[PDB]
Amino acid sequence: TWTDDQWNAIVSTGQDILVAAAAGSGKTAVLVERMIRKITAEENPIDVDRLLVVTFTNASAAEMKHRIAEALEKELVQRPGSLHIRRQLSLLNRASISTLHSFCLQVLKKYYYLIDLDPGFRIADQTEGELIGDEVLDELFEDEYAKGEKAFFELVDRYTTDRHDLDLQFLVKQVYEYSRSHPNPEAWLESFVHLYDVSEKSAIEELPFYQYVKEDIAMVLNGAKEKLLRALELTDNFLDDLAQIDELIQHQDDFSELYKRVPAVSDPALLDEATDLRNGAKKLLEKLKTDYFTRSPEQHLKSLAEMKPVIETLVQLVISYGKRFEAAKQEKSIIDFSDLEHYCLAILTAENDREPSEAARFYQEQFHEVLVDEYQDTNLVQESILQLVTSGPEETGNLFMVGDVKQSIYRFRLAEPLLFLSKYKRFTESGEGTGRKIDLNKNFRSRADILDSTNFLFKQLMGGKIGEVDYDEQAELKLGAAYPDNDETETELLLIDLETVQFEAKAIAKEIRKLISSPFKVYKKTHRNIQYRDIVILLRSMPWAPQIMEELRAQGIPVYANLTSGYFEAVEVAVALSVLKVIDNPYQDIPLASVLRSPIVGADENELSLIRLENKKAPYYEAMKDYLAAGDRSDELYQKLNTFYGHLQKWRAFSKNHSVSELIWEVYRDTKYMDYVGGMPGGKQRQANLRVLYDRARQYESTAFRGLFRFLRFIERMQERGDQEDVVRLMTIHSSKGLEFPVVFVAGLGRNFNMMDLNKSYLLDKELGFGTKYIHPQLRISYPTLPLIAMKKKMRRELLSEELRVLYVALTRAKEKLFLIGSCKDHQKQLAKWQASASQTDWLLPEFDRYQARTYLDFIGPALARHRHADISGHPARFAVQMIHSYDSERLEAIRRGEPVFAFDEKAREQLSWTYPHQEVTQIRTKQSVSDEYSGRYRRPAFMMKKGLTAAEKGTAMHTVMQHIPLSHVPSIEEAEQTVHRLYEKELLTEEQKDAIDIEEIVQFFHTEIGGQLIGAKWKDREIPFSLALPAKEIYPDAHEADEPLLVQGIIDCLYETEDGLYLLAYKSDRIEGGFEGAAPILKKRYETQIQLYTKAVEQIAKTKVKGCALYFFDGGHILTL
């Protein structure tokens, strides 16, 4: 069965539809069914290729195809005579179901000729692409420096830390990369200046950015008052303060007014707690003052208008970068992932003087409906592409989108959830003359205590400017699980107070072992004890990942976490590269030493220093050689070196003829480093690391780069800048996604969010554009500009929204049990901070206090306190709080040298001593020609070479003639020429070959005895191809064991038959006269072997016998018999 909401999503039609699918909505199943119907229905079915389905991964798309396939089979078994249904089953491979990028690719491939794009274009990975950006940038900056334009230097002096210019070039990238999130980058770039065009005559309450200044003041002022009022309830001077505040609240609108007021005017438990509340006012007001009111509205304006010249320079720079970048790609026929979307949009839009091009029209025609998953993460470029392949205005049309704003956690990649949210508020629950929207509340996959705990917290947290979304019914999760009633399913909070992570990791570790030793049986299925793989620890970031893993594996099950970097500081990688470095250039003291001391060689410290002694001044490399040369053979350290120096020179030569990836593998199998690395702790991850280096070398050969040197720098770049077992899985909340677990630990909840983004001298924003500090290089003075401050306030409450959703996916990824684990300093006090916040009724916490939040605790804590004022504390959510004070053999030693002392003792012995019986024939060529790529046996350019022929080419020419000469009778010098000319006409002879033929030497043969005999005969044939199977030995004596037959193939020049028997004939252009009496013996032995094979072939295959064989020689016209 379905819910009415699912049923709606499945059957609705006639307009755009937005499906808000909560966690575990079963959206996939519903998405499948909807397509299944339109494709398999009695009324009037449609083919699959008429649908467009975009997903966020090729795996989920592939997943889509499988589930579509099954249902088709099922639908088929019932209608076994369905021609349409069977056909659809064949269309799934031709259907468009993929990531939007995957679609864009198909578009570019098809309509490439409309834009400027080389078919067979290549997609560069985000790495080489950036490395190209660095290059074009350096060229750009160099050109500007040389051009010496005034404006340029003003921009540089201003934004780069003098003493180096590095800082300017990532601002350029940062800006560029941002612009690409816009359907029209350039325009959006030129949009920057419009903000900085202002006068002292301008109204600040008007312009765009002040919106966030307005709302900021509103909060703080109100937050002040609301923070004071309680001090009054605590029960004088708070009325002076208060009255003054009210006076400010009256003028919240007038900014110029605030500049006049704000700057100028401004029990021992509850007694000393009421004083800090009054300080809250001070602190909040002081900040309010410093931010906006330390300078006049007029001076703020002047400060702004002054930076306009700079902003223009900056923009024109980024634009020049964009052009150069694109041009650089074109040269190498490549594109980025941004290009993929933008070129597609370019194809889809053909504007003259904005039009949905005829390419667009095709896709609008082709797709009857378009389905987009994870829509909350869509950007502007994608959306404009979507709106373009979708046919019809919003009221009607075939756009069908599904997702959940509450689960939008990717804004740092510039995804726009407001796009989804704007449509949700624009759409009605019905379909009347607008986009139809549907909600999926039921969570079929999670237990009640989960949904209740999650619904409980985010009801007091998500909302207004922090949540960006009102948390209400039709939004709240609803129970659809059939879970049996059981306890210890309660959500737990473990509060604890470098070692921070240690005390944090153990608390986690503990309850885990509680779970394992204790029953706790996970779940018409049946209960299951904890397999360690059903439990997971989710972190926001991965600085603690390594530390956690350690002690969690210190006792019991090990830990698996998907590590990203720290890869270049990995010992193996270091050593491996070190080896490649020495192979490239042996003259590097550090890289060489790093190898010699590594397990690969294993030199001692005394051995290393011993080496240097030989030569102190010279580089270490030859200090090693100098040790070798004069060294004594019986020396151990000498061995180690000599062996290594042997490999080095082998590797040196090897890379010369081979690729980098190949050399790497060779080094791995020569040193057995990868094998060795598998024998030390964590050797599994180490081996992986060692073989991704090989993979990256593979990815590197397909790039615009080549050679070992470039590869090294390539890796050097990555360094400098970017970089079925049952175990506890440690992973980021961001990587959690559609994944799901019985038990979920979310730790680090007591750690600050990353606000580092809002600090620097500049900020990039979608709406507002570019913002920066006022900076004067001559006066050496700088300070935040008004827009800058405005962009921060906005960005902070948007960044905070993101975190509340990140925390929302964390809790929803659980099916049965939850662990919330935070950390702080002083227990009680924070709970008092929380008490202060948790007073206000209405559920949803104070919009300002949520704002002040820094750490996840600041969200949970206060929302948790009020729980355990009617429904809030009676809410069917359960919790368990823990206040933690934070403080509370022979075989190896045999292996160390020799062997120990089995069931397989006998088999292991023979398999290692085994041999391939037919081995010695495995390297021998099957076919072997005698004169097709399947057989075996200093040229100068024709334009620089002579005019004539070579002895070989002449011979071939002479040969051809003899084989085409009519054997009817004895030809004359003339009749021979006629043949030579006929060949020439028919093109069996090149103009040269013709002129190179000596007719006499050809006619001569037919005057010899053999000639006359050839003429007069019962039967004759020439150019006779043959293949003769022989025992391998018969040719190759060397190998003696295997007697498998090989094919010897050749052509018998001539065979003729007389009343005597069968005779053989061969013409040879060998040079003789320069008598022939002495040449005969030599010639005889030259073709001695060949001729026997000929007769062999005839005698064995034809089962007749060859009596005598003649050879003719054009030089002198001789003959000899064998």
């Binding site: 042996p586 003291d589 550090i590 598998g678 003075i781 057989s935």
Partner: protein, 783 residues
């Protein structure tokens, strides 16, 4: 190829091999690159390293090394473009460098003469050809052909002069079609480039007994017993309709209806895929294996194709095996299939013993395998391999016979050399013991910048005195002039004239200038206030110089003559007698942390101070008491204030930020001698203040003369205890973490020390952040 090479399985591949990795193809490409990108040294050595330019008859061994050394050179000196075309130790070197380029430049150079001059194709294709012959490519090729054979590789030897024809036929066809057509390198090279990519090697002829590895389309087979099918992945096996060619699937399908038949290509192929997988599945007589990988080359997920599903429909009860390199995941049976070869047996056993010590119960097949390998001849190696089982990165203490002859008779100490030791004993061994040197580049590093400032400042003095002038007599006009000229004299002679190399650097020039100009003005303002007058400047301390080195005698025949520099020493007369303080110019902010001093990380200032004090008596005939140690911050500031400021107040804020940080003396007068402008409140020149009563503030960085003479002694004992450990031959590895920071930051020797925390026995020695007093009393307790 790799896998089967290891597993010793002979095979035959349908496809052919690209020639893009062949020396001849490279040499050609890189050559054109050399004269297009205008002699980027990367390209030059790209050609030289195909060693087709190598001198004739001269032993390769040397040649390589000479080439490498030349490479290093070109890298550190940024040699490019025209630079190419333009007594004991340096002769050997510099001449080798002139010999090497002497056989490199001419051939590659003469070519560019030819190329650029030639207009049409044929003459360009020809100029290229000569470049090959005049360098004797054929000869050297043939030579290399031999070495391949003598090493057992004939196949490789065959591809050599087989590569020779490929390039020629390319030229021939080129000059055939467009030979007499005009054109220049831009397009000419592009076509050569596309020619190389297309170049192929002759298909490797089949052998009597081989495994047949080929495609699933046009490959043919006969009498096949067992057939394995690879990549049954979805999107792969029933290959998604390929989007290629000039005509779209739509176009072709349309043409059909007009009575025109073309190649299928689009959707028909997808119909034909089933026939092709049908022939594949029915190919073998005995067995059929259909496999698919779960993960990706990079780790992405991969699903099976619809074929596997249907196979499961025709054989619902058929189980499907698992292919893994983790034998413990399978039964003893399968685990016995890994012992196919010595090498692979080893590689697997090593990993099994590992996972075994981890408390996991392994299979006895590997114990058997172990004992077998342990009974052979190459036992030795396997033994090595298995030593990995217990590998703790171990540093064997040096011995006496080595440390002595290595480190030398006298250990000529440096304050920096001592800091590097106590930072991490191993780093010392690598730097001063093994004398390891990083590769030099043409980048201007942060430190060398400092060396500029010094010499600039030192230079400014000389001219001041020469005009009988002093910093305080200076004007804002003069500060600028004087400073600029200083960098003029210097810039060209700094770091391989990198400042003159590119445009970005000549901007970095006046950048460094404007800094000095400011610092010059600040010093003036500091001289008009300070009552301290400089005595010695850049005082030569140790070795050959104004002062005797300070010596260290300790048990075990130890000798430590440590040398050093003294940036500035200043004198001021008070009622308490002579006063001496030391100033050192610095790039960063903070100067002295007592916590760092305890562990001997910062001994610079305190050690300098002693000498000045101690030697004061003899030196200038008077006993001095320490005024303190100061750090001057060299930089051009950016103040940030919310308060609007006038030029008046701006100069104040700029001035305040050069406020010196360090360690002072805690009496009223010493402060006032350092800042004579100060009456009450805080000082902008130095970190100290004065209450109304005349006493200074608790915020002052000042301490009693006792504490000063306390630290000084501590620095001594450090040089002693750390001075002997060296002679003892201690090279151990012990990085510190304090406070939350480490010495491994930019440390170059990290790859040599190979420090691994996870691996036990390798630890970070912790140091604790300490209130200046908390390490103060610690010192007090020592003696």
């Amino acid at each position: 190829k790799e896998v089967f090479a290891d597993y010793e399985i002979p095979y035959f591949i349908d496809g052919k091999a690209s020639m893009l990795n062949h020396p001849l193809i490279e040499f050609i490409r890189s050559s054109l690159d050399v004269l297009k990108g205008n002699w980027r040294y990367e390209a030059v050595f790209r050609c030289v390293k195909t060693e087709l330019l190598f001198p004739l008859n001269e032993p390769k061994a040397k040649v390589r090394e000479q080439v490498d050394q030349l490479e290093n050179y070109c890298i550190a000196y940024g040699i490019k473009g025209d630079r190419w075309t333009k007594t004991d130790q340096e002769i050997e070197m510099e001449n080798m460098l002139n010999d090497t380029r002497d056989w490199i430049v001419p051939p590659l150079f003469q070519l560019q003469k030819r190329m650029k001059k030639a207009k049409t194709v044929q003459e360009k294709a020809e100029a290229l050809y000569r470049y090959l012959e005049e360098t004797d490519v054929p000869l050297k090729l043939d030579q290399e052909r031999q070495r391949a054979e003598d090493d057992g590789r004939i196949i490789e030897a065959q591809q050599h002069q087989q590569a020779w024809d490929a390039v020629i036929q390319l030229l021939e066809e080129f000059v055939e079609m467009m030979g007499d057509d005009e054109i220049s390198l831009d397009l000419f090279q592009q076509m050569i480039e596309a020619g190389a990519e297309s170049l192929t090697f002759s298909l490797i002829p089949p052998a009597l007994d081989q495994v047949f590895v080929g495609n699933m389309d046009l490959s043919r087979m006969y009498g096949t017993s067992c057939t394995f099918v690879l990549g049954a992945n979805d999107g792969v096996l029933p290959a998604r309709p390929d989007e290629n060619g000039v005509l779209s699937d739509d176009d072709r399908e349309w043409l059909k209806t007009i009575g025109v038949e073309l190649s299928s290509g689009g959707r028909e192929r997808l119909l034909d895929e089933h026939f092709l997988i049908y022939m594949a599945f029915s190919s073998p007589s005995d067995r059929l294996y259909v496999s698919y990988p779960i993960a990706d080359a990079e780790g992405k997920t991969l699903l099976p194709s619809m074929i596997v599903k249907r196979l499961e429909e025709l054989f619902p009860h058929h189980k499907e095996r698992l292919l893994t390199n983790e034998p413990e995941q399978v039964s003893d049976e399968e685990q016995l299939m890994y012992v196919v070869n010595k090498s692979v047996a080893q590689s697997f056993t090593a990993s099994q013993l590992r996972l075994w010590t981890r408390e996991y119960d392994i299979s006895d097949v590997w114990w058997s395998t172990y004992n077998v390998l342990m009974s052979e001849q190459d036992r030795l190696q396997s033994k090595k391999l298995f030593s990995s089982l217990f590998f703790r990165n171990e540093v064997k203490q040096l011995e006496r016979s080595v440390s002595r002859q290595l480190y030398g008779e006298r250990i000529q100490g440096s304050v920096s050399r001592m800091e590097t030791f106590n930072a991490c004993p191993f780093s010392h061994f690598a730097s001063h013991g093994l004398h390891l040197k990083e590769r030099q580049f043409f980048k201007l590093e942060a430190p060398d910048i400092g060396q500029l400032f010094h010499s600039s400042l030192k230079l400014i003095s000389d001219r001041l005195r020469d005009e009988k002038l002093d910093w305080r007599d200076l004007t804002k006009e003069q500060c600028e002039l004087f400073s600029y000229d200083a960098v003029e004299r210097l810039a060209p002679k700094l770091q391989k004239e990198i400042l003159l190399s590119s445009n970005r650097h000549y901007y970095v020039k006046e950048k460094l200038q404007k800094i000095v100009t400011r610092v010059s003005g600040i010093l003036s303002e500091h001289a008009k206030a300070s009552g301290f007058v400089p005595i010695g400047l850049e005082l030569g301390f140790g070795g050959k110089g104004p002062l005797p080195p300070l010596t260290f005698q300790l048990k075990n025949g130890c000798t430590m003559e440590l040398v050093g520099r003294i940036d500035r020493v200043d004198k001021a007369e008070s009622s308490k007698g002579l006063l001496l303080r030391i100033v050192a110019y610095k790039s960063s902010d903070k100067g002295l942390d007592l916590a760092e001093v305890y562990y001997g990380l910062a001994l610079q200032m305190l050690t300098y101070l002693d000498l000045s004090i101690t030697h004061s008596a003899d030196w200038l005939g008077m006993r001095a008491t320490p005024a303190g140690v100061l750090y001057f911050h060299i930089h051009d500031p950016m103040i940030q204030s919310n308060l609007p400021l006038g030029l008046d107040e701006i100069e104040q804020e700029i001035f305040k930020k050069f406020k010196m940080k360090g360690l002072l003396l805690g009496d009223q007068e010493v402060v006032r001698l350092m800042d004579t402008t100060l009456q009450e409140g805080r000082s902008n020149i130095i970190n100290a203040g004065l209450k109304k009563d005349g006493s200074l503030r608790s915020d002052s960085a000042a301490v009693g003369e006792k504490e000063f003479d306390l630290l000084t002694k501590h620095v001594r004992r450090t040089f002693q205890e750390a001075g002997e450990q060296i002679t003892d031959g201690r090279v151990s590895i012990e990085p510190y973490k304090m406070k939350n920071k480490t010495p491994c930051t930019y440390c170059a020797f990290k790859s040599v020390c190979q420090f691994d925390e996870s691996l036990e026995e390798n630890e970070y020695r912790p140091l604790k952040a300490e209130k200046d007093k908390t390490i103060l009393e610690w010192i007090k307790k020592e003696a």
